[PDB]
Amino acid sequence: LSISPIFQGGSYQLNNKSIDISSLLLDKLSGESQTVVMKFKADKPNSLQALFGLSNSKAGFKNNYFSIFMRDSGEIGVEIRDAQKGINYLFSRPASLWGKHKGQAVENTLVFVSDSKDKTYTMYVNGIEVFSETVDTFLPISNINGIDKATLGAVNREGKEHYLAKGSIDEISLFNKAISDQEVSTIPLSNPFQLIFQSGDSTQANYFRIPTLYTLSSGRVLSSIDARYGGTHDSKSKINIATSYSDDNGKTWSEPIFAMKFNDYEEQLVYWPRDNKLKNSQISGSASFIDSSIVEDKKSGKTILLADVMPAGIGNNNANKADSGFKEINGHYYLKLKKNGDNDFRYTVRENGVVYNETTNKPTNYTINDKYEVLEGGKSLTVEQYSVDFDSGSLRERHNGKQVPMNVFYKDSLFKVTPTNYIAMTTSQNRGESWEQFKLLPPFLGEKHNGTYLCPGQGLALKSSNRLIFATYTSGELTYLISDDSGQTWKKSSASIPFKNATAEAQMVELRDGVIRTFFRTTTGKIAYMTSRDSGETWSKVSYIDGIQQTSYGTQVSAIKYSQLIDGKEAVILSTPNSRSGRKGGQLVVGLVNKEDDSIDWKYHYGIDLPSYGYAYSAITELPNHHIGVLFEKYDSWSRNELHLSNVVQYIDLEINDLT
Ligand SMILES: CC(=O)N[C@H]1[C@H]([C@H](O)[C@H](O)CO)OC(C(=O)O)=C[C@@H]1O
Ligand SMILES: O=S(=O)(O)[C@]1(CNC2CCCCC2)C[C@@H](O)[C@@H](O)C1
């Protein structure tokens, strides 16, 4: 750093008894700007505990203190309080911490900058900015009226220990300066994780959800994700699908590119509001992609990626359930279009993108190209792009002066698709270095049924054939999409399930040649499964796994077949929260296959981090060196308290010995 600390100490054990460092620190504090750098572990935290306190300990001044505190939910924050000044600041962010990794307490690196010149308080944990708050009336942390105690592991209020901590502070430094963002980035870290996608990267999305991982035949490992712009909200929103790969067993990852992108709205990095008045603000006029899945095709060598596609302002809540968006004429399916001013859909898209008029069966002078863009007489039509802002105190979506190709999925398009959900595919011929323009899959359940929903994660490539399968769900069933010709044509295999309107997110493993077990989310608090023994043509009844708990609403479960024997048996690995309370208590569960009947003995449970720390959607893959890569949402993506968090989708590397 550009300056030396005014105080430095270390190896403090916090065992429900605070340590007083007043004599060491208080007379060193000077000026109105301070930086606290603290390396600390808390693998068995109390419900709510202070790591560091500056306080007025005298009778009558219980509300005059500064503290850095944490919760056993993983939340970190500060309080800055002075009764005389009439100031009570509370800043925090959920899901900011690690507890344990590979059975070992994680050294978290916390940097808090209190900057009087910019009147801004900024918190970083593990190299990640979790909050930055500017105020009209700045309160320097050591200018609190009557401060007489500096405390580790509690806050001294009126002579008593409040917020008693269990943990350790291995290193703490304080500086009479607000160190710059640049200098913060030089502070050495001890992180157990890495980021593949992150705020400020090439996607310019401040948020990410729905990770995938897939190990390709070359040894490259590929990842996809929802790059979500309008906070962490599902569609309707602006969301693109981004990808990144690793050629060195997950050690380093490429700068992300888009596999599927719309441009009716600008790609903006926005700090979405988290207060109770505005947090449900939602980009409402943008088209989007959501929930991707990846597979590799042995035949063509192509990588194939599917995702749901949502027209402008559409998501699963308002998608028309009674319309596929296609017209069936003969045995063929054609995308329907509504033209500006018509109250019905009087057009279809035919072969070679010719826009046809259904009311008179004439072709028009309009065509749809390979990017689903509108051409008139071969000339590209355009629309004006939108940008979003909260400058007026609420969400505004408005034209920004920039023209972009007119797309049938856009709000401002001359021709518009049916307001319902679709599935598209794209392919890469260079293992994720570039992606083709996407194609819509045809409808599978008839003219008047909305599309199914893609199960995020991996598709399945069968070992002994060229069959490709992508699981999807809808009301009352899993609908497996099957291709035997490199994704050129698809057919459905329907498998009834005993829940109506479920989110039956399903992932498959091939237990042995032609035998597929599918594990899926339900509404019962238990993960279910079904088996196919004819490469997906037919499916067994549904069974449930005991020994793992989910919530009533459930969470995606990822699943792989391990290439190596474990305890002499074939192994399957599941990744899921294990909790009936929320999306937390992340585990990998190792199951050994009983060859006699293909039953699975769930023998090992690996705790990814604390039971109380967040874990939601996840991706797992066997890396080429036989380690396991896990990319997962490290927060509760269901909780309405943990919306719009940045850099919570994280990646770790595990070995089987860590799991057993
Ligand atoms: C297409 C879509 O909306 N998919 C979303 C899915 C869906 O909303 C479901 O109906 C309710 O779980 O929910 C979740 C979720 O965190 O639970 C993530 C998906 O991105
Ligand atoms: O067996 S595959 O289905 O082709 C696959 C990869 N197998 C290799 C075997 C050799 C070690 C690394 C993983 C498993 C799925 O989880 C995908 O990652 C693709």
Residue whose CB lies within 8 A of the most ligand 2 atoms, among 214, 215, 565, for a mutation test? 215
Pair (383, 308) in one structural domain: no
| Alpha-carbon span 87 to 89, nearest angstrom | 6
Amino acid, res. 278: L
CATH number, residue 44: 2.60.120.200
| Alpha-carbon span 111 to 546, nearest angstrom | 43
Q: CA angle, corner 79, sides to 276 and 181, nearest 5?
A: 90
Ligand nearest the Cα of residue 453 is: 1
CB 500 within 8 A of CB 567: no
Give the domain-ending residue among 356, 384, 419: 419
| Residue 656, H or E segment | helix 656-659
Pair (317, 347) in one structural domain: no
Pair (412, 431) in one structural domain: no
| Alpha-carbon span 199 to 648, nearest angstrom | 10
Nearest Cα to Cα of residue 315 among 279, 351, 340, 288 = 288
Q: Measured in whole angstroms, how far is the alpha carbon of residue 595 from the centre of its chain? A: 36
| Alpha-carbon span 582 to 554, nearest angstrom | 9
Pair (129, 8) in one structural domain: yes
Cα(101) to centroid of ligand 1, in Å? 28
Cα(461) to centroid of ligand 2, in Å? 9
Pair (631, 535) in one structural domain: yes
Amino acid, res. 293: S
Q: Which residues contact 475 (CB under 8 A, 6 or more apart)?
A: 500, 501, 502
Q: Which residues contact 43 (CB under 8 A, 6 or more apart)?
A: 99, 100, 105, 106, 167, 610
Q: CA angle, corner 226, sides to 221 and 231, nearest 5?
A: 140
**Residue list, ligand 2 pocket, CB within 6 Å:** 214-215, 458, 461, 560, 563, 621-622, 624
Active site residues: 234, 505, 617
Ligand nearest the Cα of residue 307 is: 1
| Alpha-carbon span 38 to 171, nearest angstrom | 6
Pair (6, 151) in one structural domain: yes
Give the sheet arrangement for strand 108-115, strand by strand. 7-15, 166-175, 34-41, 108-115, 120-125, 128-134
Q: Is 156 exposed, middle or buried (0-12, 13-18, 19+ CB in 10 A)?
A: buried
| Alpha-carbon span 627 to 646, nearest angstrom | 27
Beta bridge partners, 359, equal none
Strands 221-228 and 207-215: antiparallel
Pair (436, 405) in one structural domain: no
Residue carrying the six token digits 């039509």: 381
Atom of ligand 1 nearest to the CA of 616: 16
| Alpha-carbon span 575 to 587, nearest angstrom | 6
Pair (160, 269) in one structural domain: no
DSSP for residue 409: T
Cα(1) to centroid of ligand 2, in Å? 45
CB 442 within 8 A of CB 326: yes
DSSP sequence for 170-186: EEEEEESS---HHHHTT
Given 3-state DSSP classes, what are the helix, strand and coil percentages for the chain, each rounded to the nearest 5? Answer: 5, 45, 50
| Alpha-carbon span 276 to 522, nearest angstrom | 30
Give the domain-ending residue among 404, 419, 434: 419
| Alpha-carbon span 631 to 212, nearest angstrom | 7
CA dist 222 to 212, 269, 430, 629, 649, Å?
8, 24, 12, 11, 15
Pair (331, 439) in one structural domain: no
Strands 363-368 and 257-260: unpaired
CATH number, residue 375: 2.40.220.10
CB 328 within 8 A of CB 449: no
| Residue 181, H or E segment | helix 181-184
Task: Provide the H-helix boundaries in 257-395.
Answer: none
Q: Which residues contact 405 (CB under 8 A, 6 or more apart)?
A: 263, 371, 373, 380, 381, 382
Ligand nearest the Cα of residue 639 is: 1
Can you point out the beta strands (E) in 302-456?
303-310, 326-329, 332-339, 347-349, 354-357, 363-368, 374-376, 379-380, 382-389, 396-405, 415-416, 422-428, 439-440, 453-454
Residue whose CB lies within 8 A of the most ligand 2 atoms, among 622, 625, 627, 630, for a mutation test? 622
φ and ψ of 356, to 5 deg = -105, 145
Q: Which residues contact 641 (CB under 8 A, 6 or more apart)?
A: 94
**Residue list, ligand 1 pocket, CB within 6 Å:** 210, 234-235, 290-291, 308, 315-316, 453, 503, 637-638
CA dist 109 to 84, 112, 121, 129, Å?
33, 10, 17, 11
Q: Measured in whole angstroms, how far is the alpha carbon of residue 111 from the centre of its chain? A: 24
CB 110 within 8 A of CB 123: yes
CA dist 383 to 239, 265, 266, 386, Å?
19, 10, 13, 9
CB 61 within 8 A of CB 158: yes
CB 352 within 8 A of CB 369: no
Pair (592, 481) in one structural domain: yes
Atom of ligand 2 nearest to the CA of 623: 12
CB 312 within 8 A of CB 235: no
Q: Whose CA is nearest to atom 3 of ligand 2?
A: 461
How many of the other CB atoms lie within 10 Å of CB of 342?
Answer: 13
Pair (141, 234) in one structural domain: no
Nearest Cα to Cα of residue 229 among 259, 208, 244 = 208
Cα(410) to centroid of ligand 1, in Å? 22
Atom of ligand 2 nearest to the CA of 560: 16
Task: Provide the H-helix boundaries in 540-655.
Answer: none
Q: How many Cα atoms within 13 Å fall on the side-chain side of residue 291?
A: 26
Beta bridge partners, 20, equal 151
| Residue 25, H or E segment | helix 22-25
Q: How far apart are the first and last CA of the chain?
A: 42
Token reading at 514: 């032609």
Q: Whose CA is nearest to atom 12 of ligand 2?
A: 624
Boundaries of domain holding 144:
1-192
Resolution (in Å) of the shown entry?
Answer: 2.1
| Alpha-carbon span 76 to 48, nearest angstrom | 10
Strands 288-296 and 457-458: parallel
CB 528 within 8 A of CB 544: yes
Using CA atoms of 335, 341, 343, 346 in order, give the dihedral in degrees to the nearest 10.
-40
Pair (327, 385) in one structural domain: yes
Q: Whose CA is nearest to atom 5 of ligand 2?
A: 215
| Alpha-carbon span 290 to 122, nearest angstrom | 32
φ and ψ of 352, to 5 deg = 60, 25
Nearest Cα to Cα of residue 247 among 280, 281, 284, 222 = 222
Q: Which residues contact 298 (CB under 8 A, 6 or more apart)?
A: 217, 461, 466
Biggest alpha carbon distance in the chain? 90
Give the domain-ending residue among 367, 390, 419: 419
How many of the other CB atoms lie within 10 Å of CB of 361?
Answer: 8
Can you point out the beta strands (E) in 220-284?
221-228, 239-246, 257-260
How many of the other CB atoms lie within 10 Å of CB of 282?
Answer: 17
| Alpha-carbon span 582 to 129, nearest angstrom | 25
| Residue 24, H or E segment | helix 22-25
State how many domains the chain has. 3
Using CA atoms of 348, 350, 355, 359 in order, give the dihedral in degrees to the nearest 10.
-40
Long-range CB contact pairs, 62-65, < 8 A, 24+: 62/157, 62/158, 63/88, 64/144, 64/145, 64/146, 64/147, 65/144, 65/147, 65/155, 65/157
